[PDB]
């Protein structure tokens, strides 16, 4: 009765948290993919400059 009301409110917070976490994790995986691409490109510029140096 009343115990279910307090419990229902608690579980209610859980759902929103669950959704916030999902949105956060999704964005972070985007950020990580973005970083992998930037690393790859920077690593290529590095290779190129190191070569020029040796020339």
């Amino acid at each position: 009765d009343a115990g279910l009301d307090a419990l229902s409110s608690i579980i209610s917070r859980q759902k929103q948290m669950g959704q916030e976490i999902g949105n956060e994790l999704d964005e972070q995986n985007e950020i990580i993919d973005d970083l992998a691409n930037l690393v790859e490109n920077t690593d290529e510029k590095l290779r190129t400059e190191a070569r020029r140096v040796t020339l």
Binding site: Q14, L35, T42, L46
Partner: protein, 60 residues
């Protein structure tokens, strides 16, 4: 006892959710080490490029 049963089963499901949070929490925390390493390799790469330019600038 059907309402009682549904209520008791609800508890088992709430415990299961608690364990999912703990599982998610544990992995997020441990993955923190990987992120620490990623940040470190990048900071290190950054200083090396800076040190390298100091050298090239001196050779110029």
């Amino acid at each position: 006892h059907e309402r009682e049963s549904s209520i008791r089963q609800l508890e088992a499901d709430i415990m299961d959710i608690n364990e999912i949070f703990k599982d998610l929490g544990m992995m997020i925390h441990e993955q923190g080490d990987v992120i620490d390493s990623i940040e470190a390799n990048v900071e290190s790469a950054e200083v090396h490029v800076q040190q390298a330019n100091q050298q090239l600038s001196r050779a110029a």
